[PDB]
Amino acid sequence: MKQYLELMQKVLDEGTQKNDRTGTGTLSIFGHQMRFNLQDGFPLVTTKRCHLRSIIHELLWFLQGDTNIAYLHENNVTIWDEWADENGDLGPVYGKQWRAWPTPDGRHIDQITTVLNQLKNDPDSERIIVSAWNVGELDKMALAPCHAFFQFYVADGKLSCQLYQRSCDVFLGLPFNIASYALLVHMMAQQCDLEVGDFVWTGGDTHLYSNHMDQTHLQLSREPRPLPKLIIKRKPESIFDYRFEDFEIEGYDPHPGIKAPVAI
Amino acid sequence: MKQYLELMQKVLDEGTQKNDRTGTGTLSIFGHQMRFNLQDGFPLVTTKRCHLRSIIHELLWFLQGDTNIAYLHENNVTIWDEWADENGDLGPVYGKQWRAWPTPDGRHIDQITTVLNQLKNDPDSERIIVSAWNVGELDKMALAPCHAFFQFYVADGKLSCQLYQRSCDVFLGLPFNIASYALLVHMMAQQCDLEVGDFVWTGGDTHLYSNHMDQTHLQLSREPRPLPKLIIKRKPESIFDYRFEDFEIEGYDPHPGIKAPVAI
Numbered sequence: 001m002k003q004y005l006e007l008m009q010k011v012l013d014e015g016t017q018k019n020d021r022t023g024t025g026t027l028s029i030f031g032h033q034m035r036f037n038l039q040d041g042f043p044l045v046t047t048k049r050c051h052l053r054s055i056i057h058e059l060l061w062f063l064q065g066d067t068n069i070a071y072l073h074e075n076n077v078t079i080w081d082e083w084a085d086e087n088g089d090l091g092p093v094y095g096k097q098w099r100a101w102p103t104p105d106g107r108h109i110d111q112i113t114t115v116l117n118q119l120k121n122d123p124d125s126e127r128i129i130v131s132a133w134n135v136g137e138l139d140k141m142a143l144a145p146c147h148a149f150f151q152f153y154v155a156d157g158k159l160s161c162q163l164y165q166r167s168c169d170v171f172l173g174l175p176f177n178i179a180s181y182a183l184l185v186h187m188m189a190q191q192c193d194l195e196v197g198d199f200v201w202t203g204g205d206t207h208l209y210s211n212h213m214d215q216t217h218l219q220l221s222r223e224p225r226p227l228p229k230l231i232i233k234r235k236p237e238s239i240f241d242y243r244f245e246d247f248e249i250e251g252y253d254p255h256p257g258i259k260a261p262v263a264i
Numbered sequence: 265m266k267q268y269l270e271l272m273q274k275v276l277d278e279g280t281q282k283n284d285r286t287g288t289g290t291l292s293i294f295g296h297q298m299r300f301n302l303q304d305g306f307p308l309v310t311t312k313r314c315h316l317r318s319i320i321h322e323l324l325w326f327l328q329g330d331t332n333i334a335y336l337h338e339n340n341v342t343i344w345d346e347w348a349d350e351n352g353d354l355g356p357v358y359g360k361q362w363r364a365w366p367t368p369d370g371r372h373i374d375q376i377t378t379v380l381n382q383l384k385n386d387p388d389s390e391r392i393i394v395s396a397w398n399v400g401e402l403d404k405m406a407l408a409p410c411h412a413f414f415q416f417y418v419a420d421g422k423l424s425c426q427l428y429q430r431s432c433d434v435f436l437g438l439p440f441n442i443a444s445y446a447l448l449v450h451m452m453a454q455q456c457d458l459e460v461g462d463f464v465w466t467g468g469d470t471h472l473y474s475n476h477m478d479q480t481h482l483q484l485s486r487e488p489r490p491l492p493k494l495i496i497k498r499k500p501e502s503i504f505d506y507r508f509e510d511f512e513i514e515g516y517d518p519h520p521g522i523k524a525p526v527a528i
C-alpha cells in the first residue's frame with residue numbers, strides 16, 4: 001500500500017544501524033504514524049502475498065483469551081511456534097491481558113467487553129483503551145507485547161482506532177499487525193451498529209532487519225494493486241462468537257510472495 | 265511553536281463537535297503526531313507565557329512517586345487542586361505507577377529505575393518503556409492518566425522519547441505536557457551521559473474546549489519566537505536528586521500570558 005511502501009522507503013532513507021538482542025542487526029527509525037481509511041478498502045498488502053488464514057486465526061485466538069498454540073495448531077498456524085515452551089505456552093501475552101488483566105485486589109478485567117460497553121453506552125469517552133502492557137507480568141511472557149496499546153474513537157457514526165506499536169518488524173510483522181487491527185475494527189463496528197472509520201498506526205522502534213534488505217528492495221520495486229474488500233457474512237450475538245468462515249475477502253490480487261527469515 | 269500552532273489550526277479546521285463528560289463541549293480530532301528536535305531548543309511555547317515553575321515541580325513530584333498535592337502546595341503549585349480528596353490525595357496516579365507499579369502478587373516495580381538501568385546497560389533495547397496505564401487501578405484514580413505511556417530510544421548517542429497522550433486539552437494541557445517530557449529527557453540524558461534527541465508527541469482524542477475559542481484565536485494570531493535553552497546547574501547523584509534550583513531557562517521571551525478556565 002502506498003503508506004506501507006512509503007514507510008519502508010523512510011526507514012531505508014533515515015534509518016540508523018542498531019545492534020539488536022537477536023544479534024541480527026536492524027535499520028531503525030523512531031516515531032512514525034500512518035492512517036488507513038477503512039472505507040477505501042481492507043488494508044491487506046498487495047505488493048506481496050499475505051496469509052489471511054493466519055491473520056484471522058490469531059485474532060480469534062486473542063479474542064478467546066488463549067495463550068497456548070494448540071488452537072493455532074488445530075488450524076495449521078505456526079507463526080508462534082518459535083517462542084512457545086514445551087507445553088505450547090507463551091505465558092500471559094495478548095489474549096490473557098485483553099480478556100483477563102489481573103488487578104492487585106484479586107480481580108481480572110475483561111478489557112474487550114469493557115470497550116464494547118463503552119462504545120455502546122459512552123462512545124464519546126476519551127478513555128476507550130485496551131492495553132497489553134502489563135508491567136507486572138512482562139517477565140512471565142515469552143516475548144513482550146509488540147502491539148501494546150490501542151484506543152477507539154467515535155465520530156459521525158464511524159469507529160476509528162489508533163494502535164501504538166512499541167517495536168515493529170516492518171517487512172514481516174507490520175502487514176500482519178495492520179490487517180489484524182482493521183479486522184478487529186470491522187468486528188467492533190458491526191457489534192455496535194457503527195460504520196468503519198480510520199485505523200491509525202503509530203510506531204516506536206520501527207525497523208527492517210539486516211537480512212530483509214533484498215526482499216525489501218524487491219517489494220519496493222512493485223506497484224500496489226487495488227485494495228481488497230472485507231465481507232462479513234453474519235452478525236454473531238457477541239464479538240466472541242465469530243468464526244473463520246464468517247469472513248470473506250474479495251478482489252485480493254497481490255504480487256508474488258517473498259520469503260524472509262524471522263529473528264527469534 | 266509552529267507545530268503547536270499548526271495543530272491548533274487543524275482542530276478548528278477539521279475538529280468534530282463532541283459533548284464531553286464535563287458538559288462543556290469540545291472540537292475534536294483523533295490521532296496526530298509531532299516531533300521536536302531537542303537540539304534546536306527547549307520546546308516551551310512562546311506565543312503565550314508559560315509557567316516553568318509548576319511544570320518543574322509537577323515532574324519532580326512524579327519522580328518521587330508522590331500522589332499527594334501536599335508537596336505541590338509547599339511550593340505554591342495549585343494545578344491539581346480540583347481533583348484531590350479532602351486529604352489532598354489523587355489515588356495511585358502517575359507518581360505511584362512510575363515508581364511502584366503493584367504486581368498482582370504484592371510486589372512493586374520501579375519503572376524509572378528500570379528505565380535508567382536499561383539506558384545504561386542496554387541502550388539498544390526496543391522496550392525502554394514506562395506506562396502509567398494500570399488497568400487494575402484506574403477506578404482508584406481521581407483522574408485516569410492523560411499522558412499514559414512513553415518510550416525511550418537511543419541512536420548515535422542521542423536520547424529520544426515518544427509519548428502517547430490518549431486525551432489532550434490542546435490549549436491548556438499540551439504546552440505543559442510537552443515541556444514536562446522535554447525536561448525529563450534532559451535529565452535522563454544527563455544521568456546516562458547521552459545527548460538529547462527528539463521528543464515525539466502522539467495524541468489520541470485531541471481537542472479544544474468550547475470556552476477556549478477566544479483564547480485560541482488570540483494565540484493563533486501571534487508569531488512564535490526562538491525557543492529558549494534549558495540549563496542544568498548541577499548533576500545530581502541520581503535522577504531522583506534534582507531540585508527546582510537546578511534548572512535555568514535562558515532566552516525565553518514569550519508573548520503575554522492568556523487566561524482560560526479549566527474544564528472540570
Ligand SMILES: C#CCN(Cc1ccc2[nH]c(N)nc(=O)c2c1)c1ccc(C(=O)N[C@@H](CCC(=O)O)C(=O)O)cc1
Binds near residue numbers: 054080169172176258
Ligand atoms: C505480527 C505478527 C504475528 N507473528 C508473531 C511474531 C512473533 C515474533 C516475531 N519476531 C520478529 N522478529 N518479527 C516478527 O514479525 C514477529 C512476529 C508472526 C510471526 C511470523 C510471521 C511470519 O513468519 N510470516 C511469514 C510466514 C507466513 C505464514 O507462515 O503464514 C510471512 O511470509 O509473512 C508473521 C507473524
Ligand SMILES: C#CCN(Cc1ccc2[nH]c(N)nc(=O)c2c1)c1ccc(C(=O)N[C@@H](CCC(=O)O)C(=O)O)cc1
Binds near residue numbers: 344438441
Ligand atoms: C497538563 C497538565 C497538568 N495539570 C493537570 C490537569 C488536570 C486536569 C485538566 N483538565 C483539563 N480539561 N485540561 C487540563 O489541561 C488539565 C490538566 C494542569 C492543570 C491545570 C493547568 C492550568 O491551570 N494551566 C494554567 C497554569 C497557570 C499557573 O501556573 O498557575 C495556565 O493558565 O497555563 C495546567 C496543567
Ligand SMILES: *c1cc(=O)[nH]c(=O)n1[C@H]1C[C@H](O)[C@@H](COP(=O)(O)O)O1
Binds near residue numbers: 170173174391
Ligand atoms: C513482534 C510481534 C508482533 O506482533 N509484531 C512485531 O512486529 N514484532 C517484532 C518487533 C521486534 O522486531 C520483535 C520483538 O522483540 P523485542 O522484545 O523488541 O526484542 O518482533
Ligand SMILES: O=c1ccn([C@H]2C[C@H](O)[C@@H](COP(=O)(O)O)O2)c(=O)[nH]1
Binds near residue numbers: 409431437438441
Ligand atoms: O496532563 C493532562 C491531564 C488532562 N488533560 C486533559 C485531557 C482531557 O481534556 C481531560 C481529562 O478527561 P478524561 O479524559 O480523564 O475523562 O484533561 C491533559 O491534556 N493533560
